[PDB]
Amino acid sequence: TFIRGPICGTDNCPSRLWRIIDGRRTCQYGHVMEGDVEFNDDED
Amino acid sequence: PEDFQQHEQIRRKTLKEKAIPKDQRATTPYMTKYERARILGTRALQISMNAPVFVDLEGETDPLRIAMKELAEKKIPLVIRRYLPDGSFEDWSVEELIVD
Amino acid sequence: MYKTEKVDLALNRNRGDPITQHFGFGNDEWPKEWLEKLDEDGLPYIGTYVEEGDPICAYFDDTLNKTKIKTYHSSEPAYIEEVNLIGDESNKFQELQTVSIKYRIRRTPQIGDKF
Amino acid sequence: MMKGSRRTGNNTATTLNTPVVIHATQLPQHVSTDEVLQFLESFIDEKENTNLSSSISQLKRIQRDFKGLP
Amino acid sequence: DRLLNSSDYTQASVCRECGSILTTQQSVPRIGSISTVCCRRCSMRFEDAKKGEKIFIDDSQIWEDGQGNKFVGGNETTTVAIPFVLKYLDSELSAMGIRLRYNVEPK
Amino acid sequence: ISKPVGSEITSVDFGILTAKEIRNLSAKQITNPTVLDNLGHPVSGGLYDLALGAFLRNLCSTCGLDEKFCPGHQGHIELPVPCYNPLFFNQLYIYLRASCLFCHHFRLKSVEVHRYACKLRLLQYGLIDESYKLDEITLDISSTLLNELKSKRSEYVDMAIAKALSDGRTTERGSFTATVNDERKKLVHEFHKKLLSRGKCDNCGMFSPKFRKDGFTKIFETALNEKQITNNRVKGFIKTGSTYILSTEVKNILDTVFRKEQCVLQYVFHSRPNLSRKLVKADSFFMDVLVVPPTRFRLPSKLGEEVHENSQNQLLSKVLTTSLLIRDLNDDLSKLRVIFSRLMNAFVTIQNDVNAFIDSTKAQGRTSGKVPIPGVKQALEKKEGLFRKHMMGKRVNYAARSVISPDPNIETNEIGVPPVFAVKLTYPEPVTAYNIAELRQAVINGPDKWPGATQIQNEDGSLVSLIGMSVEQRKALANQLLTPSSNVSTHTLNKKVYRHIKNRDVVLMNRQPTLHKASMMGHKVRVLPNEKTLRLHYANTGAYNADFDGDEMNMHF
Amino acid sequence: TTCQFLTKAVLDNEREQLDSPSARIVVGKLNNVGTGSFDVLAKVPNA
Amino acid sequence: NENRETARFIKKHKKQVTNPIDEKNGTSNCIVRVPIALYVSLAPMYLENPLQGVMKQHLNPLVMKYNNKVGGVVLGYEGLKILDADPLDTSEKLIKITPDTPFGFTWCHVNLYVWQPQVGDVLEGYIFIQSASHIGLLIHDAFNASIKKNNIPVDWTFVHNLGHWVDSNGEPIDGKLRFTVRNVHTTGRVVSVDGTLIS
Amino acid sequence: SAAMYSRFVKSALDDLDKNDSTQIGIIANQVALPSKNPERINDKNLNILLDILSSNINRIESSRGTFLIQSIINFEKWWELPPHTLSKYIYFIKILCSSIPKWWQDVSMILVSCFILPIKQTVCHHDMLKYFLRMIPSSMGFIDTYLAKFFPNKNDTRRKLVNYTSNLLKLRGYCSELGFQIWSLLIEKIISIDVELQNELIKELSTKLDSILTLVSTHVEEQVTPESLESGEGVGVFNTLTTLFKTHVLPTYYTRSIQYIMFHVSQQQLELMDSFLVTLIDISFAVNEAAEKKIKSLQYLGSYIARAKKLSRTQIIFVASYLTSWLNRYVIEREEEVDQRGGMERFKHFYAAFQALCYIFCFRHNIFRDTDGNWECELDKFFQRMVISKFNPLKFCNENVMLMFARIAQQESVAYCFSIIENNNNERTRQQFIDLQSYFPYDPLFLKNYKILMKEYYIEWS
Ligand SMILES: [Zn+2]
Ligand SMILES: [Zn+2]
Ligand SMILES: [Zn+2]
Ligand SMILES: [Zn+2]
């Protein structure tokens, strides 16, 4: 379920991600990735 | 060093201007239902952060119900800053008002 | 209730685009429990309880060498009623790039359901 | 990310770390050896009656610098 | 609660001379230095250092970016609490060519 | 509340940035309009540079940080032509239509301008009556005597303010009242009528014909009628119809006008008194260099299996391609007719793209392209846009909506809450010695049983969740609450275990047509098991005016 | 007509004092009506 | 035009009060007193004892770090003076709570003692050790100093081993040494000091 | 390679007046090889190369000069150099304090990361500390805080934990001015393992508490000695533990196995205990204290007295000179609010300490005899008076603590409240009064290994 992508902070390891609450993505242990932007758009 | 001297002299004199002392104060001697709100917020907002509690709380976990146990005994150490729209103010303690 | 869903690879495919990705799994992989929702052609068993987060079809491409399944894009406990393996028009012979899949959402009268 | 997130602890400056405005109200005036060593006799007597255990020792070395020998 | 504390509660940094929010910046430090906060339009580069008999610096305004340019200027910031959309409007007011020279009162 | 805020903002100023300080703040100008090529690359010197914040999970150039911590930055664009800001073509055209193109002044008088100059000096303080009595104190047009009239009006005004500053009436900051502001719009609007209509000049007999505009691009010096050509030279002794004027020649007119008639325009623009004495010049009307928004405020949208390009990069590169072409066409007329007709058309597609960067209802363009691609004025003018859309109408966290229902077994100051709501909404409850009997049982339960908690918070600000744990770690960390930190900054700040919503929290409620404010009240939460909808009492529904046809009422914890 | 006023307000050099509720929200300031018209100050017992 | 705007910069960095060469020791005078004004953030838990809360949270981490406002390493303080917000000296003064926090901020006068290094100074402190291209020192048993061969004359060679110094008298050099201070560089957290020898 | 490689790097020394940095990134990168690689530097080219480094820094130092200094400081296993070049390699790190007063940051990164390695591996770092922390006062901040940044992971083995504690305990005996934080980081992060075992009451965690905390109790036993109490600072270690026991371990709930570190030290002589329990009188009997922060200390005091062997028999009467004298104060003052309409829920402070006095009586019975058949201040008459009063303590004491108050008062004829024990079926929020009448802070310990250090100083059953 995890993707090929970036490494981030929280000092676990060189890590991977997947979205849980659709835009405040976390690491393995539920640590909040500080400041995502989550581009979207509404239709009509 | 020298221009903060021309900055605290001006400000605290200007702060000394718009004070209205205990003999000249002529606003209401009541607690005007928003004062009762913001006291019971910010007094309860302090007690959440381990501020000293001047009442014998007996099994209460809510900071709000604890702060409504100090207001019932006139214990809350706050001073209300009632502004007037010129800029002036009158300073009012919790002890000298009447909670409705 | 019912609702059907188009599963189109040819919506991305251009005219002279070769037939790139194909329903079913592939190799250089083994993610399990997709075999518990899907059948060997990468199309699910009819009557299998799906949710959100669950695989709905396995299309293994050949430009990335990995089965990138798509997922039931709703939040209600559904099933699969019937699957239809849809052919193509301008030819007679190429593999399918269009599936239709029919869902069975059950809806008892819960509280709030208007009379 | 890995280097950018721990810079919140590099500065680590809340309002419980730093004062907000730092304005010297007056001019700098020099203090002599008889005044510093009397300041260091007065103030270091006060903080010995918690943390600051590291910087007390650092000022004891300056204290012994004006009364003793390394 | 419902327009700052639970929509876009943001603590940005404001330069207390030029009055901006965007043009403040965490300094990219020297490899043993500490990342401080330095502004942009109060910051002029080190090249403007014409000529007491010298113009020596007491290691105060000297900061560099990731590009490496020595700038002299841009200190004296603080922490405010704004909605983030104010920061977005300030860019969109800059797009028109209109600044927002703020005032920040502890001085 | 454990992340406190120090200093704070109280007032906003306005005014226009210089040509100089856009460069002092940002020397990262952009020349490449082609934003992305093969391998999707953000080119340095293009609109999606890393010098304007980080982008595509990179590190920023100038911030030195990732795409998640850089704000982005600003970047100028060298415009070799004076593209005026289209929100200021109203003003400069009116200041042009009185500025005499021969005598390097207005057409007006020395003292007629000075009256409105001196009266706005009185209307920037808390005094209106002296602005009228200034018109009263007056006295064969001999300017040798009338310098005493110049020596008389403002000399009173030198002391009328000094009389007023002697009182507590006004300070040198001034006084700005609506009744002061009402009469300020009566000088200036009348000042902007007689300047707009003058026959000749006064300090000479020479003058200009009527400037005629178009839809906010062109300025013409029209054909003077044959009575008035002679009237410049019968006094001045002792080309075709609608000759085009361009913003360089317009800036040539606006040099000795804002320089010489500075004292009037020091008070016309600055409504408050001037604690800055910066001179007024036409460079604030024109946009000499543009700016570029941050990368975070400029990325293309995406939907479905697609990506959709931003508005403000299509019409930012189209500036720069014209900036490319107006740089390319430099050497052609520099090394030698119709070459000027090739040249003058380059001052329209650079005019229509500062017009399209800001407006879109003020641009000619080509066709009507289904509500065409906006500028930035159009990002701010509707019910949608920004102010009503996301400044007045900010969407909120910690909030739900449901279908109301009758329930007569709850109190009239209450609401019934399902366990679906009761395991999502959290309250950041700090820890003490009196709540520790409950917050320890909150971490034992977790977000499975209702009297519980979702995630906790140490003294650093870490949102250590409680999802992956179980009864081993959940019993362990509850006694990891009263263990103070040896980090010296964090010895006051106690821990905030985000519990669920309890039987004692009070929650707003909201019908969607809120006409009377009593559609927005507060309720003690009673969490009802075995349910999936809100539960309301009949006492409430006479106040909210919401019958039980199943209305979506919001809810705010 | 947002930018119509924003035309004139920058022509005004308007030092906006942020005292209306349709301006204290713009900067997110505490609104001056009700529980925000008056400050609340703590009297500490010691010097 | 650009002659009176430069005075905004010349008056900006240049400290006023010099280090005069006092008591003919060779050392100038660098320990200097200045009073300041903070802007504290008093804790809610230090409401009962508000003098202990201002000092512990903002003054105990203030000593023995270089301070970019005074331009000196803060040696020590004494004498907190919390102001008041009621312009009525006495005990029950009153401070102003921030509207969103329980943290109430106020003004304090307090008195500092710092260390003042400048250019053109000459100081004396013990040498710890040395090398054939640099010589490191200690000042007041708190303050480093380093003298390198680009500050040292040519004929001063080096006896080689710990290898000691050889001057023009041919002697390993003593502890206390007179030296002229070059530009101070505060790159590390430890305050680094550069110095010269020639006049 | 004898003197060829000296002039080879003397040409790389020439990069101040030549400025090319050609040979900089070869040998320092060749010494940037890992430690188990047989391609790297020998000991013969270790000498004269670093004599160019020790005697010269001006002809290197730049932003380019960082490179040949990084790879030499970060040389892992740097005590595996020959002792005729350990004199030389330290002589480069000696002057590293004196070259630029910034690079002492970088060695202290590695000094505390080698605290994981034992004394038998890394004995040389202790000589570097005392010979240079006297030199540098203005660095003690990140000295004190890198025991938290280089702190070992919570799920380590014993090899990263039994030797990290050994670098902390040996060091304060020769670094006696860094301060309070040194002792505290144990008591702070003993509880990270303590609470993770009584919820498990697999065996990785127990030997972290058995044999690694054994070093904690052994070293503090060696800090209390009959000369550090007379002229040294054996009371100073008692000071820094007295001001620490009140902070991190007493307010935390259900906390066994850790308070023995306080319990093992202050049991020796008359001096430490007559300043630790009179401090506890200021804790567990003060009006100014929180009335809900006093039930546990009156329960903690109750099980200290009846589980400690080296206290005098005249010192146990000192408890009953004040705890029973505390019941000479409730008898006058507050025996008069019961006829006022109010239950006994307000007196959960009063039955907190009254349990502890009966907790002594259930254990200490054969101590206070005389030859003349009496008891100390009429022990067989005090528990008769305070039970038959109008408070009915038989219901508000636990059944198990009254099962044991009854059999003892039947054999020696102390109390005869047996027919009133029977009269509680027709006589009888609540959870905070049953657990603290059963939580005992000095339980017989599940750990079999720590009781080696505490066989005598902890009392058995009988
Ligand atoms: Zn980590
Ligand atoms: Zn700025
Ligand atoms: Zn940047
Ligand atoms: Zn004229």
From Swiss-Prot, chain A:
Zinc finger (RRN7-type): 1-34
Binding-site positions, Zn(2+): 8, 13, 27, 31
Compartmental location: Nucleus, Nucleolus
Function, as annotated: Component of RNA polymerase I core factor complex (CF) that acts as a SUA7/TFIIB-like factor and plays a key role in multiple steps during transcription initiation such as pre-initiation complex (PIC) assembly and postpolymerase recruitment events in polymerase I (Pol I) transcription. Binds rDNA promoters and plays a role in Pol I recruitment. After binding of UAF (upstream activation factor) to an upstream element of the promoter, CF is recruited in a SPT15/TBP-dependent manner to form a pre-initiation complex.
Miscellaneous comment text of the record: Present with 398 molecules/cell in log phase SD medium.
Assembly description: Component of the core factor (CF) complex, which consists of RRN6, RRN7 and RRN11. The CF heterotrimer may further dimerize to form a hexamer. RRN7 interacts with RRN6, RRN11, SPT15 and RRN9.
Entry's family note: Belongs to the RRN7/TAF1B family.
Domain characteristics, as noted in the entry: Although it shares weak sequence similarity with SUA7/TFIIB, displays a similar subdomain organization as SUA7/TFIIB, with a N-terminal zinc finger, a connecting region (composed of B-reader and B-linker regions), followed by 2 cyclin folds.
Name of this chain's protein: RNA polymerase I-specific transcription initiation factor RRN7
Organism: Saccharomyces cerevisiae (strain ATCC 204508 / S288c)
GN (gene name): RRN7
Swiss-Prot record, chain C:
Superkingdom per UniProt: Eukaryota
Cellular localization per UniProt: Nucleus, Nucleolus
Membership in a protein family: Belongs to the RNA polymerase beta chain family.
Further comment: Three distinct zinc-containing RNA polymerases are found in eukaryotic nuclei: polymerase I for the ribosomal RNA precursor, polymerase II for the mRNA precursor, and polymerase III for 5S and tRNA genes. Present with 14100 molecules/cell in log phase SD medium.
Binding partners and assembly: Component of the RNA polymerase I (Pol I) complex consisting of 14 subunits: RPA135, RPA190, RPC40, RPA14, RPB5, RPO26, RPA43, RPB8, RPA12, RPB10, RPC19, RPC10, RPA49 and RPA34. The complex is composed of a horseshoe-shaped core containing ten subunits (RPA135, RPA190, RPB5, RPO26, RPB8, RPB10, RPC10, RPA12, RPC19 and RPC40) where RPA135 and RPA190 form the DNA-binding cleft. Outside of the core, RPA14 and RPA43 form the stalk that mediates interactions with transcription initiation factors and newly synthesized RNA.
Protein name, per record: DNA-directed RNA polymerase I subunit RPA135
Chain's gene name: RPA135
From Swiss-Prot, chain H:
PTM remark: Contains an average of four phosphates per molecule.
Residues with PTM Phosphoserine: 192, 199
NAD among keywords: no
Keyword Nucleus attached: yes
Keywords: DNA-directed RNA polymerase, Nucleus, Phosphoprotein, Ribosome biogenesis, Transcription
GO molecular function: DNA-directed RNA polymerase activity
Localization terms from the record: Nucleus, Nucleolus
Top-rank taxon, per record: Eukaryota
GO biological process: nucleolar large rRNA transcription by RNA polymerase I; ribosome biogenesis; termination of RNA polymerase I transcription; transcription by RNA polymerase I; transcription elongation by RNA polymerase I; transcription initiation at RNA polymerase I promoter
A GO term from the CC aspect: RNA polymerase I complex
Protein family membership: Belongs to the eukaryotic RPA43 RNA polymerase subunit family.
Oligomeric form and interacting partners: Component of the RNA polymerase I (Pol I) complex consisting of 14 subunits: RPA135, RPA190, RPC40, RPA14, RPB5, RPO26, RPA43, RPB8, RPA12, RPB10, RPC19, RPC10, RPA49 and RPA34. The complex is composed of a horseshoe-shaped core containing ten subunits (RPA135, RPA190, RPB5, RPO26, RPB8, RPB10, RPC10, RPA12, RPC19 and RPC40) where RPA135 and RPA190 form the DNA-binding cleft. Outside of the core, RPA14 and RPA43 form the stalk that mediates interactions with transcription initiation factors and newly synthesized RNA. Interacts with RPO26/ABC23 and with the initiation factor RRN3.
Additional note from the record: Present with 4070 molecules/cell in log phase SD medium.
Protein known as: DNA-directed RNA polymerase I subunit RPA43
UniProtKB/Swiss-Prot annotation, chain I:
Keyword Transcription annotated: yes
Subcellular location: Nucleus
GO cellular component: nucleolus; nucleus
Swiss-Prot/TrEMBL keywords: Nucleus, Transcription, Transcription regulation
Biological processes per GO annotation: transcription initiation at RNA polymerase I promoter
One Gene Ontology molecular-function label: RNA polymerase I general transcription initiation factor activity
Protein family membership: Belongs to the RRN3 family.
Subunit details: Monomer. Interacts with NOP53.
Stated role: Required for efficient transcription initiation by RNA polymerase I. Interacts with Pol I in the absence of template DNA and stimulates recruitment of Pol I, but does not remain as part of stable preinitiation complex.
Note: Present with 138 molecules/cell in log phase SD medium.
The name this protein goes by in its record: RNA polymerase I-specific transcription initiation factor RRN3
